[model samples]
Target: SLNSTGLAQAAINGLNARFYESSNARWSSDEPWWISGVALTMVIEYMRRSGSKEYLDQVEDVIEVQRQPLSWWPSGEGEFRADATDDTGWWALAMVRMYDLTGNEDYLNISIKDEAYMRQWWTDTECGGGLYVDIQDLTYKNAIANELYLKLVASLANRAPNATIYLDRAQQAWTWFLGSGMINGVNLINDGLARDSNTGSCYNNRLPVWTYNQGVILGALVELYHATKDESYLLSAQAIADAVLSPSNGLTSSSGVLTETCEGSDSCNQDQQVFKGVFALNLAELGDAVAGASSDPDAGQDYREYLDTNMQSMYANDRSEIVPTLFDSSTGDLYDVSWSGPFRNATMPKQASAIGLYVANI
Candidate 1:
């Protein structure tokens, strides 16, 4: 328990040692643009917690390069300007966190522009009123896209300028989301809304409930509670959280480690591998909000214990011995996608995914 904080720090450092190129101040291009955003948010939170200045300039360098027009997303509009709104939202939320840490308007400004880019993708025609997953595929209105939008807009309202405007948008989005029937009878969010060809109506896609699909909205509702002083928002957040917390929900193992269905068969893709980390990060956010608002002495203990259990399990089971060819530091540790056991080879997604648990406990 005592060594946990420094262990987490070194774990993040090891991730950078293997995955980040210090000479060029760039991350490995093996991962996608938005996963980099998740990586950046983890590092930013690390620095914020430890008051470390080591990574500040490098973060700025990476952000500077990313905001420019790229070969894939050649639009000169803003940071992470891409066709997929989920990707855009991931990057935008990272900027918001950076702004919170640095108190810099530059980060906020970039997020504002990115949020505006996401706003254009929202349409009332489908799923009542949610952003399209991709502009190219207008028919698909998914959970991640809309959940990201909800969190992004709610964060902006809580922290940035035009609070009322952003708050209004968040309320509208949340209203549509609740009415969209995406949250199934089990209280978990599905992949997206399915359109019925016969009735021309939308219903829960009833797809596999990804951990991230159940995670992002927790933070969004926390932000809404903060912004509006609305207890109902926290209630809604807890409803979804409680579902994940339940053993029967299949979101967690009997041992309480967070589990993705894909992890069962070892079939997780790169993107899916990162889903549990997002869940951990947002659950921590919800925990913080609940702890602040509740007067009970044991208010948020369950969430804290759940996170710490995963952290301890990760330290005990998922860590891999440092192969010099795979890592820069002999003392550094790498983690696998399955936090329960049977260590596998590492990827940026696998390494970056565990940072959430480490940072939360720290």
Candidate 2:
């Protein structure tokens, strides 16, 4: 008989402990980079939402641990890894959160520095002009990376006067994402492109969308709308949210619970499922914001219901004793033990982090 608040608190506690144990309670870690950054952000958000000093203290420890350069991982990596684009974005987000909460200039400085690095790492002039998903790969651009870069730019714009380049790049990336990547009203594209433009394959036929991609884009749109007070961004966000929640899109409660597998697999993992929840919850919150601005009472209610239903399903299926488990609620498929594990699913730390972030806002 766990109430919503209790469930949220439990999830938050679980995330904090996992982060503490795995990375010495710091944002840096020897483990997978995204998990560490995502976990830190989640813990910080939990502290903000709950107004819990204990959680804030734990977050401070993590921030302190990450104070050193190359603290992102113990290997002392200098350049970004192939999969670390989103990790950098998460770090930017965590730094912003810290700045907002404590008025800390150091956190703001770190976030600005990270934004500069990410802009260089992910930007490319290919495809007649677009941002690459990573530095290692030049031929491809991803919806998530574009979205993350846009968000970081918008966040930095509020504080720095010289962020116009970041802002313009973000706007361009969004335009490219909308024009080139979106297919059949769905906002996602996988990582593959031919050397010659003639043989390129557009896999816009995929369904249910990746949760992280959806979350990143939704977040980007929300930030864009806030910055410019533009109705189009809000409209775009609503459309994407509808696709994410629509039963016709193969992303509904009646549909089989979604899981994360590699490019060719059918298996679903915990990270995938949790990210679905994250996307849903984030869209739901954004819907509320859009609703507040409009005269229409139901501006985004349909999307909100869809997001809520998906999040509840995720909560119902979690089974971890130390953290939430990675099982399909409908089919009872356990995808993996931890994030990036054998099943290629979300780890306990990541699940907790995603859940914490989703619930805090919603």
Candidate 3:
């Protein structure tokens, strides 16, 4: 695992070259919510780990530079759609994190407004509550939308001036999501509702167990525990984290390396490609929370090992030092989805994912 043993700085070097500065790709062209905003958190995580200043300026720019040019969208930066509930959820959580780490009141205020926007998407119809993936597309309710919603509300509850309202909303999101049957018989999270219903009824569509689907719920559970100091929350997290450890069929390879189901087959799109890193980061968060958890004494250490192993695989198997591509010079490296470098160009999300994965472990 030498590739990941102290490779945090090394990986940052590559990300700085290939993604952040786009030394090999387009500069500042990725969607702020998806590629670039997530990258900002990754840099913060890196600083949290190594006390390094490698990517801080770019991190500040992600907030300041993008925030202003974003046409004063309250969710902050590049409002591709006024009803981007899912995208707004992404930045909302990031804003909360920025506040937690830096105590910036602006970041906290952003989270409050974004959480309010997300709450508007919370539908209480048919099968009950959860945020719709798109306010415009009501057909299928997706898991990540609600997952981010739960975490955002819980995070805001932790830091907001009025924590009670956010806490109640956070509890509401958790109640609906756990009972939604979205995980089904598989013992892991699924993608979303399979088909749209005219009645607006909720249905548990059994889809693939993508890593991000699994990842966010773990985070939400941790936040739930933080908000309530409830042992039940920790126990639920223990159960879910345990399900993901079955090397034969779980999210990772036998040695505990994280793997996207479609990694070798070339089946992942940008979002799917970046998902495992999310799992890595959250699993590591659960590890920190448990600290000799009653459910499994080894839970914390196991999660750490999972992170190191996955990062080692990523480093060893990477195809290029920076960008590899089915190059669209017009779109830059956004086309590249390859985490071990890419035929997809160098991508910020993949790099950010990598950075997050290693940051938590190292």
Q: Which residue segments of model 2 deviate by more than 4 Å?
A: 1-3, 26-31, 71-83, 122-124, 137-139, 182-208, 255-266, 269-274, 320-346, 357-362
**RMSD to native for every prediction?**
1.9, 6.3, 5.0
lDDT ranking from best candidate downward: 1, 3, 2
lDDT against true structure, model 3: 0.68
lDDT of 1 at 248: 97
Ranking 1 against 2 by lDDT, winner: 1
Please, what is the whole-model Cα lDDT of each candidate in the order they appear?
A: 0.85, 0.56, 0.68
Q: For candidate 1, what is the TM-score? A: 0.95
lDDT of 3 by residue, 1-362 (tens): 26442565655566665555434122346534455656666666667656665555666666765444244344433422235677777767777777766777988887777777677777777458777776666665789988988888888777788999989998888888888888766468878865455665666787788888888888888888888889798788777777787775556666566667777687777667567767777887788888744577665777777666666556666524544457732221122344443343556566667767777776
Tell me which of candidates 2 and 3 scores higher on lDDT: 3
Error of 2 at 189 (Å): 4.7
Considering every candidate listed, which one attains the maximal TM-score? 1
Whole-model lDDT for model 2 versus the true structure? Answer: 0.56
Steric clash count of candidate 2 = 8
1-362: candidate 1 lDDT, tens digit per residue: 44656876777776877788665556678777678888888888777766776779888988988787766767736577787899888888889989989999989998898889889988877656888987776889999999999999999998876989999999999999999999989889999988889876899888889998888999899999999998999899889999998999888899998888998888999899888888988898888889899798788889989998888888899987566756443457788898896687878888888887787776
